[PDB]
Amino acid sequence: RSVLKNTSVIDKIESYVKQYKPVKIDASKQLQVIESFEKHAMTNAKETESLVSKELKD
């Protein structure tokens, strides 16, 4: 800022950045469809696991 001796905007853009210093929050939105994806995952996985654990000894 003190490099520009003709400052005139640096307070403006500095308080503009400090204004938007709370930029935007993130997106932790998925907690319902993602658990359905891993629900189908655990479903078909335990189907496969029980079937192969049976058929190996079979």
């Binding site: 503009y16 938007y20 930029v23 997106a27 998925q30 469809v33 993602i34 994806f37 189908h40």
Partner: protein, 89 residues
């Protein structure tokens, strides 16, 4: 040294009516005030873009979503196509 002294006093003084006291500029017929502090005071923002670049556009991020929260009509088609790919596996 009257050489030195009178040269340096004219050297200081004839621009001292241009910088110290705002009496424009006696020898210059165009004025000096409506060039740098008025017209080209917007100079670097006539050299850059105004109202988007220099105002800097604190812009909200355009929010993209998850896959529309529909895990039925697509996951079961994924499982049927996965039967198909395992028949190709």
């Amino acid at each position: 040294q009257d050489l030195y002294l009178r040269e340096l006093k004219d050297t200081k003084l004839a621009p001292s009516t241009l910088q110290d006291a705002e009496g424009n500029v006696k020898p210059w017929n165009p004025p000096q005030k409506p060039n740098l502090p008025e017209l080209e005071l917007q100079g670097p923002e006539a050299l850059k873009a105004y109202t988007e670049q220099n105002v800097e556009t604190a812009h909200v991020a355009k929010e993209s979503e998850e896959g529309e929260s529909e895990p039925i009509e697509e996951d079961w088609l994924v499982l049927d196509d996965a039967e198909e790919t395992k028949e190709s596996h």
